[PDB]
């Protein structure tokens, strides 16, 4: 595993990560108080399957509950105590130690934008009237105010002033605590529309400068005011701007938007397909997560923007053979039967030496998506939902078949 920032200082940890999202939405209900135990038992399998990193659930305990129903998943934590719904503090340390010991770096989901302000029994008790909260200031709507330089979560009454020096430092110190005591190799930043991107750069500089970073900016052009250049920008431009200012890789919601709304041919318009390596190498690609996708259990999870059945293998073949940094969803890998296919694709990626900045060229004249990917060791030809017959139609050189699945709807050849 190679470390290192990008030529622009973006914390993509060498560009060679292959990430597992290590939970689904209903874990706290399907495996009560037992998930860290399961992750520890699975650590050697996760490593054998080829993952270099695991995105862990929010480690801060969350005892919220609402009624559709949910709660406890981590995104409405009430303090940093690790004895939450995924397992105990001791069980987390054991899981992180087993994962890191197997070569899987541990990335913690962290939620700075808000906390369960009203929870009656908690270690973090921030009064009103000192500037600790968004709503200490006038709050006319969902946009920055004088106590919060980003957007708000629902009504905003639980949004923290993350730029207040005491609140900034509270998170700074907890990121350091996760690194020194819980084996953190980096962080996944939740709801980054909620606070300044520069604050993520500051947090990482202070507490984990050489670690891996990724932020979730999920905000389409139409959510920006009419005077904001982002209101008429592409999804790529919006998330790339965030990554520039955070010095952090960013989830490729431009690719997700094309997978949900466009054709397979159109998947080339994700951030990870951009011909400028400074653009595509900061993309963190994914098929579904705990929010967009289904989960086992109640209500099928959230499924807010789920990829249809018929495209799952194509989508995994695309992200695992292409630039950017790919993320595999727990339930596709270990619940729903795509594991052997994904295992094969990870081996193909590693054997070809595809990394976050590998070149990718898209070919016209065929149906579907046809791409040539320049790995450090091999060239790949990838044909998804395509009438391409063979790689010699689009590439020079000698090729052999590496993947052929779904009646030829997923084909990969390697040089
Ligand atoms: Ca690395
Ligand atoms: Ca906020």
DSSP code string of 341-380: HHHHHHHHHHHHT--TT-EEEE--SSSSEEEEEE-SS-EE
Q: Find residue 373's DSSP bridge partners.
A: 360, 380
Place of tokens 């609140």: 167
**CATH match of 1-357 with 3.20.20.80:** yes
What is the helix (H) or strand (E) element at residue 171, kind and residue range?
helix 165-181
35-38 own/partner pairs: CB under 8 Å, 24+ apart: 35/86, 35/87, 36/86, 36/87, 36/88, 36/91, 36/92, 36/94, 36/95, 37/87, 37/91, 37/95
**Active-site annotation holder among 62, 79, 190, 288:** 190
Query: Does residue 149 have a known ligand-binding role?
Result: no
Q: Which ligand is nearest to the CA of 133?
A: 2
Find all residues with CB under 8 Å of 299, minimum gap 6, and list them.
Answer: 68, 69
- Fold classification of 359-414 is Immunoglobulin-like (2.60.40)
**CB contact at 8 A, 332 and 312:** yes
Strands, E assignment, 130-239: 184-189, 212-215
Q: Which ligand is nearest to the CA of 1?
A: 1
| Rounded Cα gap, residues 264 and 325, in angstroms | 19
Strands, E assignment, 198-309: 212-215, 250-251, 283-285
Strands, E assignment, 271-358: 283-285, 325-329
**CB contact at 8 A, 23 and 54:** no
**CA 13 / ligand 1 centre spacing (Å):** 4
**CA 366 / ligand 2 centre spacing (Å):** 46
| Rounded Cα gap, residues 179 and 207, in angstroms | 8
Query: Does residue 13 have a known ligand-binding role?
Result: yes
Q: Which ligand is nearest to the CA of 154?
A: 2
**Reduced to 3 states, what is the DSSP secondary structure of residue 159?**
strand
Cα-Cα-Cα-Cα dihedral sign, residues 115, 117, 122, 125? positive
Query: Does residue 194 have a known ligand-binding role?
Result: yes
Q: Which ligand is nearest to the CA of 3?
A: 1
| Rounded Cα gap, residues 374 and 393, in angstroms | 17
Ion ligand 1: protein residues whose beta carbon lies under 5 Å: 1, 13-14, 16
Query: Does residue 156 have a known ligand-binding role?
Result: yes
Q: Where are the domains of the chain?
A: 1-357, 359-414
**CB contact at 8 A, 407 and 370:** no
Q: Is 309 buried (19+), middle (13-18) or exposed (0-12) by CB count in 10 A?
A: exposed
Could you confirm whether 198 is annotated as catalytic?
no
**Active-site annotation holder among 216, 252, 281, 357:** 216
Query: Does residue 16 have a known ligand-binding role?
Result: yes
**CB contact at 8 A, 300 and 292:** no
**CB contact at 8 A, 12 and 3:** no
Closest Cα partner for 310 from 411, 402, 410? 410
Place of tokens 């020079």: 396
**How many angstroms separate the first and last alpha carbons of the chain?**
24
What is the helix (H) or strand (E) element at residue 20, kind and residue range?
strand 19-21
Query: Does residue 114 have a known ligand-binding role?
Result: yes
**Reduced to 3 states, what is the DSSP secondary structure of residue 236?**
helix
| Rounded Cα gap, residues 330 and 54, in angstroms | 10
Strands, E assignment, 47-144: 53-56, 105-110
**CA 16 / ligand 1 centre spacing (Å):** 5
Closest Cα partner for 202 from 245, 264, 139? 245
Could you confirm whether 123 is annotated as catalytic?
no
């Amino acid at each position: 595993d190679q470390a290192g920032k990008s030529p622009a200082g973006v914390r993509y940890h060498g560009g060679d990560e292959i990430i597992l999202q290590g939970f689904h939405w209903n874990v706290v209900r399907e495996a009560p108080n037992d998930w860290y135990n399961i992750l520890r038992q699975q650590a050697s399998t996760i490593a054998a399957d080829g993952f270099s990193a695991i995105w862990m659930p929010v480690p801060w305990r969350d005892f919220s509950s609402w009624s559709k129903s949910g709660g406890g998943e981590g995104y409405f934590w009430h303090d940093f105590n690790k004895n939450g719904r995924y397992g105990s503090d001791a069980q987390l340390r054991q899981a992180a130690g087993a994962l890191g010991g197997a070569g899987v770096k541990v990335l913690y989901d962290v939620v700075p934008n808000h906390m369960n302000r009203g929870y009656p029994d908690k270690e973090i008790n921030l009064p009103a009237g000192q500037g600790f909260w968004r709503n200490d200031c006038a709050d006319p709507g969902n946009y920055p105010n004088d106590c919060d330089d980003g957007d708000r979560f629902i009504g905003g009454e639980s949004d923290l002033n993350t730029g207040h020096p005491q609140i900034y430092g509270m998170f700074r110190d907890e990121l350091a605590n996760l690194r020194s005591g819980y084996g953190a190799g980096g962080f996944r930043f939740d709801f980054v529309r909620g606070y300044a991107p520069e604050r993520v750069d500051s947090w990482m500089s202070d507490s984990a400068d050489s670690s891996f970073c990724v932020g979730e900016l999920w905000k389409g052009p139409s959510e920006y005011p009419s005077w904001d250049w982002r209101n008429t920008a592409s999804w790529q431009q919006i998330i790339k701007d965030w990554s520039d200012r955070a010095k952090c890789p960013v989830f490729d919601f431009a690719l997700k938007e094309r997978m949900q709304n466009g054709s397979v041919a159109d998947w080339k318009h994700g951030l990870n397909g951009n011909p400028d390596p400074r653009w595509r190498e900061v993309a963190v690609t994914f098929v579904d997560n705990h929010d967009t996708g289904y989960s086992p259990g109640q209500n099928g999870g959230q499924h807010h923007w789920a990829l249809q059945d018929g495209l799952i293998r194509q989508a995994y073949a695309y992200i695992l053979t292409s630039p950017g940094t790919p993320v595999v969803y727990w339930s596709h890998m270990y619940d729903w039967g795509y594991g052997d296919f994904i295992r094969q694709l990870i081996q193909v990626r590693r054997t070809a030496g595809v990394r976050a900045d590998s070149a990718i060229s898209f070919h016209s004249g065929y149906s579907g998506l046809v791409a040539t990917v320049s790995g450090s060791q091999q060239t790949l030809v990838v044909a998804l939902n395509s009438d391409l017959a063979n790689p010699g139609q689009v590439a020079s050189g000698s090729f052999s078949e590496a993947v052929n699945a779904s009646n030829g709807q997923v084909r990969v050849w390697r040089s």
